[PDB]
Structure 1
Amino acid sequence: APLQLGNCSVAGWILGNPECELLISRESWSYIVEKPNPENGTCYPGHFADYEELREQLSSVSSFERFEIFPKESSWPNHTTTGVSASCSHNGESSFYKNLLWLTGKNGLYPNLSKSYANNKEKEVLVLWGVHHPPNIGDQRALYHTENAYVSVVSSHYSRKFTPEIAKRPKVRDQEGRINYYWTLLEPGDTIIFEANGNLIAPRYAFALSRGFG
């Protein structure tokens, strides 16, 4: 049986757009049914990297579990985690994706961060994150307290260093900045390491899954 996304896109559902909750949440499915112009997608505008490949990975799934990666706010005690946006409003109030967490300065500081997750399950884990591109210097400095921010994501078969640049884009859902979305599959037993000094939209929930097996 197929997974029915309702008014949500694959990106809206997997990121946890607050307007997306499946009517029927299941641990396995054969195909996904998505409507042609879904109303609820990347509510905070931005490019979703390798999106067609992600849709294919999620098209048929024999086991699926959404779980906390880096559990609780106590995983980020020296950053502010409560950032929300009018672009992802819910019930008349600014909100944010359920599966990512916007990290910004706290107490006048943005400390270097370095956080690891070890996949101690017997299934691969889909990890998603974002990299923020503010529209101007003032916004970049206000949130992250630097114009020289770097993000590093390293595992056994994946490494990428991001050097995010400012860019003023057309206003979409009130936003002239953008969040670019990224993902990778972490093999059982492997460890993923995030290091950053700004601009990281950190994983909050990740997904254990099996394909063709289960």
Structure 2
Amino acid sequence: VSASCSHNGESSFYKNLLWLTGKNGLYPNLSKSYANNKEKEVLVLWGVHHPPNIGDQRALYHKENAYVSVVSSHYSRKFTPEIAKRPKVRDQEGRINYYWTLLEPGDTIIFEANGNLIAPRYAFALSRGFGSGIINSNAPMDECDAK
């Protein structure tokens, strides 16, 4: 739970993701697999945790150094957290960086970590629309059709 998040005057966290912390003083290795039975292209969101200092790293994940790795059929990258002092934004000294990838049907994503991983609580299955980019306006919505 993050004190930066405020929903109805209560601390909370992102709905689509999950923050994982060690239980009973230990952080065992994790391994997750998902098969794409939705027949549509899925989008998965995950992030890494950069702690404020080595003390908070040891308090949260019980390890001075940790890594997270994501592998797929077409996308593979190895991630390394950085522990350093950073400017304070929204009463949070540390920062967390998010990453995304697109999976075709018939592909399996693998998550392996010993710490500093923000787990994907929810995933999104979407269809491909080719165009119609984002626009930026404050005008009121109306129920009329214009080409």
TM range (shorter): 0.7 to 0.9
Question: Contact 1:151–1:161 (CA<8 Å) still a contact in 2?
Answer: yes
Residue 173 of structure 1, CA deviation: 1.4
8 Å contact from structure 1 (residues 153, 159) kept in 2: yes
Equivalent pair of 1:126/1:209 in contact (CA under 8 Å)? yes
Q: Which has the larger radius of gyration?
A: 2
Q: How many pairs are equivalent?
A: 130
Query: Which runs of structure 1 show a deviation greater than 6 angstroms over 4 or more consecutive aligned residues?
Result: none
Q: Secondary structure at the match of 1:205?
A: coil
After superposing the two structures, state which structure 1 stretch, 114-123 or 129-138, moved more. Answer: 114-123
Percent same amino acid among aligned pairs?
99
1:168 is displaced (CA, Å) by 1.6
Q: What is the CA distance between 1:120 and its match in structure 2?
A: 1.2
Q: Deviations 1:9-51 (Å, cap 9, x if unpaired)?
A: xxxxxxxxxxxxxxxxxxxxxxxxxxxxxxxxxxxxxxxxxxx
Residues 86-124 of structure 1: CA distance to partner in whole angstroms, max 9, x if unpaired?
A: 111211111000000000100111101111111112111
The alignment yields a C-alpha RMSD, in angstroms, of 1.1
Secondary structure in 2 matching 1:114: strand
Structure 1: which 5+ runs fail to align?
1-83
Q: Between Structure 1 and Structure 2, which shows a larger proportion of helix residues?
A: 1
* Higher RCO structure, 1 or 2 (CA under 8 Å, sep 6+): 2
Give 1:148 deviation, angstroms.
Answer: 1.6
Q: 1:165 aligns to what SS in structure 2? A: coil
Quote how far apart the aligned CAs of 1:212 are: 3.1
User: Could you list the runs of 5+ residues in structure 2 that have no partner in the other structure?
Assistant: 131-147
Is contact 1:125–1:206 with CA below 8 Å preserved after alignment?
yes
TM value normalised by structure 2 = 0.85
